[PDB]
Design an enzyme around this catalytic site. Structure first.
Site, PDB file in Angstrom:
ATOM      1  N   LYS A  98       0.792  -1.225   0.000  1.00  9.86           N
ATOM      2  CA  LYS A  98       0.000   0.000   0.000  1.00  9.86           C
ATOM      3  C   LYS A  98       0.819   1.267   0.000  1.00  9.86           C
ATOM      4  O   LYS A  98       1.693   1.450   0.851  1.00  9.86           O
ATOM      5  CB  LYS A  98      -0.910  -0.026   1.240  1.00  9.86           C
ATOM      6  CG  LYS A  98      -1.808   1.194   1.457  1.00  9.86           C
ATOM      7  CD  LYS A  98      -2.875   1.355   0.374  1.00  9.86           C
ATOM      8  CE  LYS A  98      -3.867   2.476   0.707  1.00  9.86           C
ATOM      9  NZ  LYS A  98      -4.593   2.215   2.006  1.00  9.86           N
ATOM     10  N   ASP A 246     -13.265   0.238   3.017  1.00 12.46           N
ATOM     11  CA  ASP A 246     -12.405   1.170   3.735  1.00 12.46           C
ATOM     12  C   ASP A 246     -13.022   1.384   5.138  1.00 12.46           C
ATOM     13  O   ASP A 246     -13.062   2.521   5.650  1.00 12.46           O
ATOM     14  CB  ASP A 246     -12.168   2.507   3.073  1.00 12.46           C
ATOM     15  CG  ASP A 246     -11.078   3.300   3.762  1.00 12.46           C
ATOM     16  OD1 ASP A 246     -10.180   2.693   4.393  1.00 12.46           O
ATOM     17  OD2 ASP A 246     -11.091   4.545   3.668  1.00 12.46           O
TER      18      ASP A 246
HETATM   19 ZN    ZN Z   1      -7.079   5.605   2.268  1.00 14.07          ZN
HETATM   20 ZN    ZN Z   2      -8.012   2.758   3.983  1.00 14.09          ZN
END
Ligand code: ZN
Ligand code: ZN
Ligand code: CL
Ligand code: CL
Ligand code: ZN
Ligand code: ZN
Ligand code: ZN
Ligand code: ZN
Ligand code: ZN
Ligand code: ZN
Lengths: 342, 344, 342, 344
Positions: A98, A246
Site C-alpha cells: 500500500k 475502507d
Molecule cells: Zn485511504
Molecule cells: Zn483505507
C-alpha cells in the site's frame, strides 16, 4: 425478495489492533471470505515478521465457524528493503503493498517522500506481480482538499503508470468523476475499489443542516456530480471496480470532538448499503460481480465457494457497538436499512 | 507593545441566544461594542414587538453595569408577517432592521421566508420607511451543492429583489465568496455587507484537512482559499460598504461535538483581535477603524460611537472552555495564542 | 401558527348541476383559483356548446368576488368526433378530456367501449397537447373491487402510454402503492392527483366498527399499506402529484340508503385536511407545491397571483349543508379539524 | 314444482335481540327451526343464570302457539366471569354453551374477552364439563386490516387455545375464509364451524360494487370470491363438521341506513331457502339435510328433531320491509325473488 451471491470479499479494510481488533473483526469475518487488511498500525506493517504476528492476532479474534482469511499488506516506506517485500510475497504473507500519500517531511520508517524514492521497490513489485494499492491524493498544504484526488491523477498516478506499464494498480476508494473516468478508460492493469459512503452520499450529506463527523472520511466526500459518476460506473457493470469498504473505525470520543478523525466504521452495514445502491440504479444484476467476482479476477484469486443471502427485510443498524473503554458508532447508526444478511 | 486605539466598535451581526447562554455570552459583546444588531432567530422567532421588548429586557438584565452597550433589535421576517407589526416596532424604537432567513438555511430558520413574493408587501413598506433588510443570502434547495448556495442566491434572488426595490437598503450578511465580494463592491450605495472574522482568517481546508473541526463549521460554509483571498482584498482596500459583523453564534459543546453538530462560531470573545490580525497581515491597519466603527454607522444612518477601545499586540490565550450551567461553551480559537487583544 | 400559500387549484372536482351546483360551487370558488370540472352530468359534456353552457351556469353560481375560473373537460365517448374536442380545445373551452372506465355494453354517447375505439381522439389529443385525465380502473365483473386499479395499470395504462409516448396523462385520484410507484417511476408526461380521503383514511376506517357510506367513493379505499405509500409519495415532495379533491357530492338520501352512491363531498374540508396530512408527515415545506405549483406546471398554466392562509384554529365541519329538498353531508361532518382557512 | 322435504332444522347461531324487535323476529326463527342457539350479546350481556332465565322467558312469550321451538341459551364470556355461574346454568339446563367475543369484535362486544389467559379457568371447567365453546374468531387490533382478522385469529389465538385445551369442543362460528374452511376441514373431531347464508351466496364485490350495501354488511366481513368458493366447496363436499348457523342479526333500518351502519344481516326470514339455493347450484342437495338438521345435533350431542319442513321450488318475493313499533326492519334479500321457499 432475496438476493443470493457468492460469498463476497472486502478488498480494503482496517481492522486496527488490540481490543479494537477483537471488536471489529467479527463484522468483517462473518460476511467476507477474505479482506485486504491495511497496514497502517501505530508501528506500520513493514516487515514479514510483523505481518505474520498481526495476521495471527486477527485470526485469534475470528469467531468460531467464520470462514475468513486475512490478506496482509506491506506499508510502503522510503526505508523499506525491496527484499523484505519480496520475501513476504514469495512466502504468501503479503498479498499486496500500500502506497499512502507522499510528504517530503515524513519519517522514512513511516511513509514515502516521493514515488522516485521508492522506485526500486515499485520495480520489484512490477517484476514479481505484486499489486500496488494506492491512496491517490496529494497532501500539499496549498491544494484544496476537494482537489487532492484529481491532482494526484495528473501529478503522480499517470506518470507512475506510464513508466511501470506492467504494474497492477488498484486506485483505492475512488471518489471523483476524474478517477471514475481514468479507471474506466484505463487498461487491464488498473482497477479500483469504491466504498459504500461514496456511492450513497455526497458532501452535502455531511455538511447541510449540520456537520456529520461519522460521514467524515478520506478521500473527502465530493460534489453530487462525482457521486453520480461513481454510481453510474458500478451500474454499468464495469469489471475493474470492486468492493472495498475502507471500514476505518475510530472510537466515539475520537469522532465527536473538536478535531475528529477521518474514517467511517461501515463493516456492519456495508453489504446491505451496496445492495441498496445497486437496486436504486436498476443494476442488481451487476451486484454479485462487484462484491464477489471482480476483485478475485483482478488479483488472480479464485472466487469463494460458499454463499451469502440478503433479504429485503428492514432492520435497524445499532446506535453503538461496545468497546472496552469507549464505543464505536457504525455507518448509518440507528437507521432502518432495506437489505439485511440472512 | 504596539497599541492600536480605535473609536468604540459596533457588531452589526450577533446572536445572543436566551436563558443561561445569553447571561454567559452577552458580556463578551457588551464589554467591547457600543451597539450590536441582535438577530431574531430564537426558539420562538422574534416576530412581534412585545416579544422583542421582552427579549431586549432579558439582554439588558445580563449586561454588566459600566458597559456602554445598546442592543439593536431585529424582526424575523416570515411569509405571514403583517407589515404593521414591523412598522410599529420600528416607530417605537424596538426594531432597527428586519432579517430575511430563507427557510431552513440555518439555525432556527424552519419558520423563515419561502419566497420574496410572499413578503413583497413588507419589503415595500421597508423601502418606504427606510428600514434596512438584512439577508442570509443562500438558496436552500437540496440539489444545490452547499458551496454554491451563496453564488446561486445572488443570481436567483438578490439581483431580482434589488431590481424591484431600487431604494431598499440591503445588507448582504456574512459574505463568504468572491462572487458576493464583487457583487457588493460593484453595487450601488443601497448595498452593503458584513464579514466575519472566520471568513477572513480561514478557508474550508482549515475545517477539513487533518481532521474535521465542528467549531469552524458555520453557515454560510467556509469556502475555497480563492474566496477567502477576495474577502481579505476587499477589506484591505478600505472599501466603505463592508463592515464588522461577527455572526457570533454560540452553541454548547454538546450541540457542537456530536453526530450532527450545529452551525455557528462563538467568536465574540476573540473577534476584534482576529480582525486586527487580518488587517495587519494585509498592511491595511489604516482601514481597520473604519471597518469596525464607521462604515456600519454610516450605512445605517447612525452616529459613530464616542468612546474608545485599545488593542495591544501582546500575546494572550483564548480559554479552552467557558462554563455554562449544564454544559460548556467552546470559544472560537479555543486554547490558541492570539496576536492582538483588547486592553481592559 | 400560519401556513400561507399561493392560491391553490383543484385539479379534479364535480360541481354537479342545477340546485346542487348552486350550493356546492361556493365551497370550491372561495378557496381555489381554478378547478378541473368533470364532465359527468346526466347528459355528459361532449360538445363545445354544452361545455360553454355549463361553464356559464357555474359562473352564474360563483359568489361575488371569488375570482374563480372553471376549467372544462370533455367526457370521452366512442361517438365523440375528434374535431369537436379539437375545436373546443383551440377555442379555450376544453382544458382536458376525461376517460372513464371502458365497458363493452356502454352506450356510445355515454362512454367508451375500449381504448382501441377511441384511438383517433387520443392521437388527436397527443398531437395538440391536450391532457388525458384517467379514471384508472377496469370494471369487469370478475375483477375484485380492490384489484381494479392495479389491473388497469397492467392492461390499459401501460400499453396506452407505450403507444402514445407524447400524450400528457394524469392518473386521477390514485389509491394504491401500485399507482404511486408507477407514477413516481414514470416520465415527465405522467402525473397524478390524490384526494384528501385517500391520504387520511384506509378501508378499515370505512368498515371497522360500522359501515360508513360517506367514506365510500371510487376508486375504493384500500389497505393501510397503500394509504402509507400515498402519504410517503406526497411527503417526498414528488413534483408530479398534485391536489385533486374528487369532491363528488350526493344528497343524504342517496348516501344513507340500501344502495349508497359513491363519492365524498370534501370541497368544504379538503384543504385543511391536506394540511394536516402534510403536517403529520413532517412535510409542510412541500404543501404549497402540491396545492398550488405542481398542477399548473404539468398543465402548462401560470401559478395563481393571490394567497390563502391556513391557521391552526380548530374549527368544526358542519353536520350538513342545506339544499332545496334534501341535504349534503360534508367530508368529516361534525368533526373538529386542526387547520382552517383565514 | 320440485319439493324438498327435510328433517326440521336447527339454527346454531341466532340473535333474537329484545323488546319489540324480539317479538317481531322470534316468529321467523320459531316457525322453521326446532332449536336455536340464542346469542348472549344484549345491551346488558347474558352473564348470569337469572338473566338467562328472564330472557328465555321473554323469548317464549313471543313464540306463537303451535311452533315446536326451544331456545338454547348461551353465556357471554367475560374476563371476570366466575366458572361457577356458567357451571350452575349448565347443570340447571339454562346454558347449552358459552360464547367468546373478542372485546369490540362486533355488536355489543365492549364487555368481551380481552385475553384467553384471563378466562382460562372457565375454559378448563368447560373442557371438564363438556360445555362447547362458540367463538367469534377475529382479532381486533387497529393495525390489522379487517379482511385479515379471521386468518390472524386462527394463528394467534385459536390454534394455541386448542393445543392447550385438547378435549374442549369448539365451534368456529360463521367462518368466512378459505383459511378457516381448511383449518376446520383438517381439524380433529373437537372442532366444528357454522356457515351463514350470506357468506355462501356473496363475496365483498356484492356489497361494494356499483353502490355500498349496508344490508350486506356483517361481521366477519364478506371476503374475496376465492374465500366464498372455498366455503361453497366445503359444504358441497358433505363435510360433517360444518352446519347451519344463520347469524341472523337484525337491526332497524335506521341503524343500518345511516352514517355509521351496524353490522348484521336479518336473514332468518330467507335463510333456509337461500341455503337450499346454494346446495342446488353446487349439485349437492344430497348433503343439504345433514347440513341443516344432523351435523349440529351430532356435534352438540343432542337428538335430531322428529318433525319435518318442506321447501318448494316456487318463487316468492322477500318483503321489502317488515314493520316494527317505531322503525322498520329490512330483511336479507329484501324485495328479491327467491328460488326456494318453506311450505306452510
Ligand atoms: Zn485511504
Ligand atoms: Zn483505507
Ligand atoms: Cl469547484
Ligand atoms: Cl389481498
Ligand atoms: Zn446568517
Ligand atoms: Zn447570523
Ligand atoms: Zn373518478
Ligand atoms: Zn371524479
Ligand atoms: Zn359473531
Ligand atoms: Zn353472531
Amino acid at each position: 425478495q432475496v438476493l443470493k451471491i457468492r460469498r463476497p470479499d472486502d478488498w480494503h479494510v482496517h481492522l486496527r489492533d488490540g481490543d479494537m481488533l477483537k471488536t471489529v473483526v467479527p463484522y468483517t469475518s462473518e460476511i467476507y471470505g477474505r479482506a485486504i487488511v491495511m497496514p497502517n498500525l501505530a508501528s506500520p506493517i513493514t516487515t514479514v515478521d510483523a505481518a505474520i504476528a498481526y495476521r495471527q492476532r486477527i485470526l485469534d479474534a475470528v469467531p468460531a465457524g467464520h470462514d475468513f482469511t486475512p490478506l496482509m499488506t506491506c506499508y510502503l516506506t522510503d526505508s523499506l528493503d525491496a527484499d523484505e517485500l519480496e520475501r513476504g510475497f514469495h512466502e504468501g504473507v503479503f498479498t499486496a503493498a500500500k502506497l499512502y500519500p507522499a510528504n517530503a517531511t515524513t519519517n522514512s520508517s513511516h511513509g514515502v517522500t516521493s514515488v522516485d524514492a521508492i522506485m526500486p521497490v515499485l520495480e520489484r513489485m512490477e517484476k514479481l506481480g505484486i499489486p500496488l494499492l494506492v491512496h491517490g491524493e496529494v497532501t500539499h498544504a496549498d491544494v484544496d482538499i476537494f482537489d487532492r484526488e484529481a491532482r494526484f491523477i495528473d501529478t503522480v498516478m499517470e506518470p507512475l503508470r506510464q513508466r511501470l506499464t506492467a504494474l497492477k494498480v488498484v486506485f483505492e476508494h475512488i471518489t471523483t468523476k476524474d478517477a471514475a473516468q481514468y479507471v474506466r478508460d484505463g487498461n487491464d492493469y488498473l482497477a479500483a475499489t469504491i466504498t459504500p459512503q461514496h456511492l450513497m452520499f455526497n458532501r452535502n450529506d455531511m455538511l447541510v443542516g449540520g456537520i456529520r463527523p461519522h460521514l467524515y472520511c478520506l478521500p473527502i466526500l465530493k460534489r453530487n456530480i462525482h457521486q453520480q459518476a461513481l454510481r453510474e460506473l458500478v451500474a454499468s457493470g464495469f469489471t475493474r471496480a470492486f468492493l472495498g469498504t475502507d471500514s476505518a473505525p475510530h472510537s466515539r470520543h475520537r469522532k465527536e470532538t473538536s478535531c475528529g478523525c477521518a474514517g467511517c466504521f461501515n463493516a456492519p452495514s456495508a453489504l446491505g448499503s451496496y445492495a441498496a445502491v445497486f437496486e436504486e440504479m436498476n443494476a442488481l444484476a451487476h451486484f454479485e460481480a462487484f462484491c464477489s467476482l471482480n476483485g478475485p479476477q483482478f488479483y488472480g484469486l479464485p472466487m469463494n465457494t460458499g454463499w451469502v443471502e440478503l433479504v429485503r427485510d428492514e432492520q435497524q443498524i445499532p446506535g453503538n457497538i461496545a468497546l472496552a473503554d469507549d464505543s464505536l458508532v457504525p455507518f448509518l447508526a440507528g437507521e432502518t436499512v432495506r437489505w439485511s444478511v440472512k
